[PDB]
Amino acid sequence: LDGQQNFAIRRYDNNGRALYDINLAKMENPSTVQRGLNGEPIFDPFKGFG
Amino acid sequence: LDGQQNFAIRRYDNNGRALYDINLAKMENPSTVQRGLNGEPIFDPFKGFG
C-alpha cells in the first residue's frame, strides 16, 4: 500500500483556495522546531519557524 | 605532544579568582550556539546560552 497510495493534509486560505500540501511520505529530510530556553519555539511572522 | 601537554584559557572574576576552564583537548561533546532567525544567539542572563 505504501508504493500504491498517497495521502496528505493540505492547508487552504480563508477563501478556500489551497496553499501547500504536508505529505509525510513525500517529505524528504523533515525537521523539528528550534525551541527556545523555555521550550517556546523560535518564530518570526515573516521568516517563519526555526 | 598531544598526549604529553595540556593547555587552556581560564576565566577569572574581577577580583582575580578563577571560575572555570576551557580546555579544548578535554572538551568531551562540545556544542555551538543556537542562533535565532537573524543569527543572534539565543541567551538568557541566568539560564545561559542555547
Swiss-Prot record, chains A, B:
Cell location: Cell membrane
Similarity-based family: Belongs to the adhesin P1 family.
Function: The protein is the major adhesin mediating the attachment of this mycoplasma to the ciliated epithelium.
Name of the featured protein: Adhesin P1
Organism: Mycoplasma genitalium (strain ATCC 33530 / DSM 19775 / NCTC 10195 / G37)
Lineage, uppermost ranks: Bacteria, Bacillati, Mycoplasmatota, Mycoplasmoidales, Mycoplasmoidaceae
Shown residues within the full chain: 122 to 171 of 1444
